[PDB]
Design an enzyme around this catalytic site. Sequence first.
Site, mmCIF file in Angstrom:
data_model
loop_
_atom_site.group_PDB
_atom_site.id
_atom_site.type_symbol
_atom_site.label_atom_id
_atom_site.label_comp_id
_atom_site.label_asym_id
_atom_site.label_seq_id
_atom_site.Cartn_x
_atom_site.Cartn_y
_atom_site.Cartn_z
ATOM 1 N N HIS B 40 0.862 -1.316 0.076
ATOM 2 C CA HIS B 40 0.029 -0.051 -0.077
ATOM 3 C C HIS B 40 0.915 1.203 0.226
ATOM 4 O O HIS B 40 0.422 2.466 -0.334
ATOM 5 C CB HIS B 40 -0.749 -0.018 1.218
ATOM 6 C CG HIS B 40 -0.226 -0.013 2.511
ATOM 7 N ND1 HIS B 40 0.184 -1.161 3.137
ATOM 8 C CD2 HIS B 40 -0.165 1.111 3.273
ATOM 9 C CE1 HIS B 40 0.894 -0.762 4.221
ATOM 10 N NE2 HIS B 40 0.644 0.560 4.575
ATOM 11 N N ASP B 62 1.711 -9.483 2.253
ATOM 12 C CA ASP B 62 1.631 -8.007 2.054
ATOM 13 C C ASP B 62 3.064 -7.534 2.013
ATOM 14 O O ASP B 62 3.285 -6.623 2.806
ATOM 15 C CB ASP B 62 0.801 -7.296 3.129
ATOM 16 C CG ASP B 62 0.578 -5.775 2.850
ATOM 17 O OD1 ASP B 62 0.931 -5.373 1.937
ATOM 18 O OD2 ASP B 62 0.054 -5.188 3.939
ATOM 19 N N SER B 114 4.439 3.469 8.725
ATOM 20 C CA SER B 114 4.422 2.001 8.106
ATOM 21 C C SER B 114 5.877 1.302 7.945
ATOM 22 O O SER B 114 6.397 1.937 6.833
ATOM 23 C CB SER B 114 3.475 1.501 7.028
ATOM 24 O OG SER B 114 3.179 0.389 6.896
#
Lengths: 50, 163, 38, 442, 419
Positions: B40, B62, B114
């Site tokens: 992302h 991910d 993140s």
Amino acid sequence: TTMCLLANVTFPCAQPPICYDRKPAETLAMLSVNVDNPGYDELLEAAVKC
Amino acid sequence: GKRQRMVMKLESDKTFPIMLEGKINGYACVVGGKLFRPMHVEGKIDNDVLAALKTKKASKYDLEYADVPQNMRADTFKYTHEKPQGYYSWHHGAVQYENGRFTVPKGVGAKGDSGRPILDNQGRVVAIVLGGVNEGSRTALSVVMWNEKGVTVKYTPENCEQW
Amino acid sequence: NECNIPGNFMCSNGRCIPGAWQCDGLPDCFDKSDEKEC
Amino acid sequence: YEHATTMPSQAGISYNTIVNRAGYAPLPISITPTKIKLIPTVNLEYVTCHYKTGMDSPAIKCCGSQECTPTYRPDEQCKVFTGVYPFMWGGAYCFCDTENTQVSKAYVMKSDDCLADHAEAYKAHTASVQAFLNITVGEHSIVTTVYVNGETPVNFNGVKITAGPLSTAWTPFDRKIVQYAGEIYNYDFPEYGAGQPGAFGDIQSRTVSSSDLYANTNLVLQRPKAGAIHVPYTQAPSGFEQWKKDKAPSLKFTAPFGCEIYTNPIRAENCAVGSIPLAFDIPDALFTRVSETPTLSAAECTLNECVYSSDFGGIATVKYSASKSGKCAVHVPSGTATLKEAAVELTEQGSATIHFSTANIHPEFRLQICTSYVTCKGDCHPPKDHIVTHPQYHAQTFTAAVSKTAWTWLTSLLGGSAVIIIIGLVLATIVAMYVLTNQKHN
Amino acid sequence: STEELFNEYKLTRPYMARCIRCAVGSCHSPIAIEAVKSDGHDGYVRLQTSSQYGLDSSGNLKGRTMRYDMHGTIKEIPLHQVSLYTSRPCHIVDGHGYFLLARCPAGDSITMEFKKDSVRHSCSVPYEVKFNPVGRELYTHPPEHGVEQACQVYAHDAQNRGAYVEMHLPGSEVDSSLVSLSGSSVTVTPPDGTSALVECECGGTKISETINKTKQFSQCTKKEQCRAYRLQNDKWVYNSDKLPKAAGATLKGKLHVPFLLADGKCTVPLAPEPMITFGFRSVSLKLHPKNPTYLITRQLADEPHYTHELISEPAVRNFTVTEKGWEFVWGNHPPKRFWAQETAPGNPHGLPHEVITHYYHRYPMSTILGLSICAAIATVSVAASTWLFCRSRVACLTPYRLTPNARIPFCLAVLCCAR
Ligand SMILES: [Ca+2]
């Protein structure tokens, strides 16, 4: 049976009063009115011979 | 106090931010000769060497991973699987490891932090922060970790928000 | 035995004459078969 | 005993069946239809022929003026011509120069040849199929004419037979029919009054021996030539002659299902379509107890010859061990094969050879001999003759010519795909459970 | 009995009428043809003329003669000096009354002619004569042999039947020859035992009649002033358009016609038999006709697909025969029926490139459809199984590659080609 005419007198169409070899001019007048008649064929056959 | 200084001293050269038109949205990790980077977080790698590579993808875990060359494998993070419960060091202070779950007290946590690895008292990476969910007063983390067998386990609580 | 064409008289030798040639006084068929009963 | 069966409508080919009343001996029935007719209800409307223009003699008046008289003849045309100057063989007919007048008259009447050469316009509806049966109920024969309606039985020796209604109401005759010269044409003629010149129906007449005839033949009187006596006319050439030139071939050449269109009653014979159900009412006096007939045990069937042909291309042997010497009936209750024999005479011990006809490349049928049931199994081979001159003595099936090789190439490539996809599902399930199982530890 | 049907035409007459082509120009011909009806099959035509047949000039019944008018007076010749022809010569069979029976080839016209003196009489009328064959095989002259079919020709006899023609009184025939001249007068001389009526228009208006009286007229001193007619009272003529009609509407009678059309039997030719060669669902036909010959074929199924063709040269006609039947009619031969049976090219018992061609020549559409759907099912199944295999290999190797140690255990290495 069928009744043919030559005047106001009915006769059977197998027994004619006249024949062509006797009186030729009057058999055509005999066959004049007798065309609208179911016994024209028998009248002509009887007028063929005596 | 000194814990943030130790995090800044350990993660000085090995941590590279991800730029997106001048915005810092994520951080990659260089450990074990591998370059971990999430899905992302989209942008360009600030390092020139790590940007000109090809990263194999894993959308279920991910994670994008790549091969760090041999001239940089010594200058990586450390990793281990032996972890007890209790306290660990994080970039904004401390993080609690209870019942196999990483929890962070509230006040901190936004969009952009993140990919920050979780360190211990020795200096080894035990987890990689990917997401977080607000739970009452004390938020929970959605991270990845390893085990004794060698299987990368992704832990994800309910209704998490990606950072 | 009859002829094929529907108006013919048949001689003794199979030859078919027209139907009015049967009794006509002139010899039509071989051996005068048509002129035998007139 | 009530017994109902279903015979296909096709003459020449035999049909065999047996009655199975339980405690009695089976009775063979063999019925061969000789002729199958189809007679429609046929209603005459008018007849037609060539015409014959009747020309009346020209009435001529010298220095006068004739007048037209009507006579109400069919298609009767009348016109009067002035200024004509006629000639006979012996000089001029008039003395005037102008003011002479002549009547031309013409009308249409039937030909002299109408009683032999004419056509008949009919109408068709409500056909009644009628059949000639050659029936063998228990080795006794009779030739039988039966009506296929839902009534009208036939009775011989107490046996009662009612040919059921045909499955199809098809007829080769349309709504309108023309019979000419022995042949029957499926033409659409105009009605009595709509006759148009140049085409079929320009002369109409209710019967051959009628007296009132319709004529629309487009008759026009023209002017006679200067200096001559004749009646000139100009009309359309005959519709009957033009129909004869432009015939399609007759209905005995163009009708489907092999119908044979015959003349004198208008009918179609031996036309193979549909199926004719039957029904029997058999008295109990023609049956026989089982113990007075050969009851057999331990019968086995093997196929000697097997050719899937139109005729009886199979030969099979039944090896039996009966109890008495006599005849009994043989029959295949399925549609796989059709026996030739229908009655096999047996001894106390031996073999019985029967003749069948099948279309299966791998036949497997349950044969009934006297009161038992054997199973004949073999393999048939193709014939070599490409074209034959007799029809097909059996009934085709779906999956009838499929070989055991073809079943193998269907099955090993159609169920093997299902085997591959279900082991893919089992492999995916085992991989998912293993990967989720290693992820439970944390 | 024979006279019984001849005396009816003994009471008519012959006459003269107009012809178009009468050997120089047009004229009044004693053999003017009224009608030519040609509907018999093997070439029999039935003329109707002005002159009569089978009678004597005095009025008796002579055998084979023809009795024609000639300018009022009646002559006769034997019938074998009368000739006619359409395109090639014809042959007179017989005659009875006004009607001749002939046998003729086809043509555009008919010219009946004879020659009494060194003066040739003719009459040509433009009436088509057609030759009508019997059967499905078209000939111009009937064969020496064959089979006999039902045909319809004009009956050679002369019997009483349904048809009648009507004979009427003759009109007043005019006669220029009858009028004549004295020194300065005009004389009308009737023939022997004969009445006449005379009409002249020189002074006032004159309508007079004589009975066998040679009358001199004092006025009207030209021949053209007077028209002399002739009177007939004991005779008939046919109701013709070429004769004036008499005063009075009496038709006086009608006579039946000879030579009507009846039901007979005619020999039709028979074609050479074809040479029939068979193929798989096919019948070939080699056809060598003598004269032109129809070929009629149809199928014995719900759609007949019939074919109809007049064949005249040698031909080869490949047809298709299914398992439902086929039927040809060749010439005057009966229908021959053919039926196909199952002989496909190939072996149904192995070698999988042979069973496909067997069941393809047997059923063409179903084989293509079944092989297409079986190949599609097999393709989807193999592609889906390979997809699930790659999915499970990714699902095996995804946790083990994200680890920084980068090792693969012993079982999952070789079984998933991990290296
Ligand atoms: Ca003779």
